[PDB]
Amino acid sequence: SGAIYVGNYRVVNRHLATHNDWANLVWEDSSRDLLVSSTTAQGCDTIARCDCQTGVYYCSSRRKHYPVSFSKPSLIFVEASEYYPARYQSHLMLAVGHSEPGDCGGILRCQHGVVGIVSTGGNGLVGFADVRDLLWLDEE
Ligand SMILES: [Zn+2]
């Protein structure tokens, strides 16, 4: 589980979005596993605006933050998980590390702020759904 709270936006994995998220929908994209809903309270997370390929992510299944190198956001084939079929996922960044389904929503951060949230796992890789291209998160 986990979310990004920026301005009046809540960023979650689409597959974990709640009824309240869908009833307050701003934007969703299945191919990215992202959903954004509107909040009544202002959020304080800073979104990274950068092309960093190093940062730190939270791994709930190890209660640990790991420093990792990660690939640039790309269209990648993801093998079947308990929450998605085998399919292509867009704007996905891979690192070498541990990821289980319950780790979805863990923050990846760099020196510029929030890069993305854990979205995929398995075969010793962790996949992160990038949010750095969503510049509208910072305004309105
Ligand atoms: Zn950065």
- CB atoms closer than 10 angstroms to residue 26: 17
Calpha distance 77→75 (Å, rounded): 7
| Closest among 93, 106, 104, 90 to 29, alpha carbons compared | 90
Specify the 3-state DSSP secondary structure of 62. helix
- Contact status, residue 35 vs residue 13, Cβ threshold 8 Å: yes
19 among annotated binding-site residues: no
Task: Please pick, among 91, 103, 104, 130, the residue that the annotation labels catalytic.
Answer: 104
Q: What residues pair up with 66 in beta bridges, in sequence order?
A: 57
- Contact status, residue 96 vs residue 68, Cβ threshold 8 Å: yes
59 among annotated binding-site residues: no
**What's the number of CA atoms in the CB half-sphere (13 Å) around residue 109?**
14
| Closest among 15, 17, 35, 34 to 26, alpha carbons compared | 35
- Residue count of the chain: 140
104 catalytic, yes or no? Answer: yes
* Domain ranges, ordered by start, for the chain: 3-44, 45-140
Task: Please pick, among 33, 59, 91, 103, the residue that the annotation labels catalytic.
Answer: 33
Calpha distance 14→28 (Å, rounded): 7
Q: Which residue has the tokens 């701003």?
A: 26
52 among annotated binding-site residues: yes
Provide the token pair at 84: 């998605």
Specify the 3-state DSSP secondary structure of 80. coil
Resolution in A: 1.4
Experimental method: X-ray
| Closest among 139, 125, 140, 137 to 48, alpha carbons compared | 137
Specify the 3-state DSSP secondary structure of 65. strand
